[PDB]
């Protein structure tokens, strides 16, 4: 990644064994749950496109999701190429070239070209654009990998309200309320909630129904 | 490896216990799956040929793969010798010699000769050439170690489409599509997919067949 040294300059350091280790472990244990996206966003902080590529290639499962990510990255690279064309000819000697849509992904661009783009004034944050594309991929997979719809989440008769709210909101996060939450509740709890009315925080509902 | 110190100079530091530890653990747990190659590429970032040699020698299993790697490295060293001959005579005192094909592998070259080649302007990236040869070896082993062919991957009647796509693409990565993926699918899912037609992303197929 690109870090700030003790002297006071931004230098490229080599990825630690733990960014890779924790990344493989979170994708292995948590699959593609929503909270897995922030991990990637936090583990890859300051990472180069090459580093992001290492993280993506380290995973050994869910290859269909990886192809989703591939297609998303190609669509975004085509949109970058369309929005920001770049000239060809000869790269000027001792000079920094423009980043293509394929360059941001790290397919053509090399690591020295990458750190040239990052250590610039003003810097071209190719890592941040690549992170944006990878994240768009990840949100897309996570949204379409949800096990059940929000309509399916309904509270059981013997189930506590807390568990129902937890299930409801984990499903709501997976697919990215107020009125819907009461509709799925059983006649118990709903008896008091309908009497509560509008303007009550989630905690008022869960306290009255505790 | 060759790292950048806080002052702002490239110095050789001694390999950490974790590069070795994580390397042995990934080769032990994941064998030669494709994602094992990026680990080596990420764990050995900035590593000297001697460091790469330590990593290779740390593994205690799959010795036939190690001999594949040996033969690949000899072929590449012979090609380096053929492409870039070097003179003999006497090494000039206080001077840096040319890297042979055997030097890049670290068989004749010593660590001081290595860090002389890396800390040079322009530097001779013997570590990167050696990494290229080791990686060519690794891709070769991984491709020829695949359990089954892509033709074998077929979707079962009761198996979800997601699992079939996952198997198909893990096999495709192991041996380094569009039309083939539909052919191996059962009559179910294929019923809708044939109606979809060309121009649909992988996600369109997996959404319609969900």
């Amino acid at each position: 990644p690109i870090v700030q040294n003790l002297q006071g300059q931004m230098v490229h350091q080599c990825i630690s064994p733990r960014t890779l280790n924790a990344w493989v472990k979170v994708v292995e244990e948590k699959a593609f749950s929503p909270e897995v996206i922030p991990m990637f966003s936090a583990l890859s902080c300051g990472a180069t496109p090459q580093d992001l590529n290492t993280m993506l290639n380290t995973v050994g499962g869910h290859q269909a999701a990886m192809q989703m990510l591939k297609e998303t990255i190609n669509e975004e690279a085509a949109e970058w190429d369309r929005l920001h064309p770049v000239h060809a000819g000869p790269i000027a000697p001792g000079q920094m070239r423009e980043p293509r849509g394929s360059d941001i992904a790290g397919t053509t661009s090399t690591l020295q070209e990458q750190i040239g783009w990052m250590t610039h004034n003003p810097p071209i944050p190719v890592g941040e654009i690549y992170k944006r594309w990878i994240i768009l991929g990840l949100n897309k997979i996570v949204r379409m990998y949800s096990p059940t719809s929000i309509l399916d989440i309904r509270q059981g008769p013997k189930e506590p309200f807390r568990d129902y709210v937890d299930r409801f909101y984990k499903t709501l996060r997976a697919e990215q309320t107020e009125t819907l939450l009461v509709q799925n509740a059983n006649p118990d709890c709903k008896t008091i909630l309908k009497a509560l009315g509008p303007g009550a925080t989630l905690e008022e509902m869960m306290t009255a129904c505790q | 490896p060759i790292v950048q110190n806080l002052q702002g100079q490239m110095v050789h530091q001694c390999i950490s216990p974790r590069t070795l530890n994580a390397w042995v653990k990934v080769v032990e747990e994941k064998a030669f799956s494709p994602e094992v190659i990026p680990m080596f590429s990420a764990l050995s970032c900035g590593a000297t040929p001697q460091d790469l040699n330590t990593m290779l020698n740390t593994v205690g299993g799959h010795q036939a793969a190690m001999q594949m790697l040996k033969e690949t490295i000899n072929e590449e060293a012979a090609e380096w010798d053929r492409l870039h001959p070097v003179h003999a005579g006497p090494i000039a005192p206080g001077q840096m010699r040319e890297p042979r094909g055997s030097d890049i592998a670290g068989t004749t070259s010593t660590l001081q000769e290595q860090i002389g080649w890396m800390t040079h302007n322009p530097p001779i990236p013997v570590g990167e050439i050696y990494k290229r040869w080791i990686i060519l070896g690794l891709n070769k082993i991984v491709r020829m170690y695949s359990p089954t062919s892509i033709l074998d991957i077929r979707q079962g009647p009761k198996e979800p489409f997601r699992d079939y796509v996952d198997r198909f693409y893990k096999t495709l990565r192991a041996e380094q599509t569009e039309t083939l993926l539909v052919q191996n699918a059962n009559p179910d899912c294929k019923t809708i997919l044939k109606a979809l037609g060309p121009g649909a992303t992988l996600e369109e197929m997996m959404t319609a067949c969900q």
Partner: peptide, 13 residues
């Protein structure tokens, strides 16, 4: 496309 099925991340056609 920048990426195609069957190759690792960061490799051209």
């Amino acid at each position: 496309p920048v990426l195609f099925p069957g190759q690792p991340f960061g490799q051209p056609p």
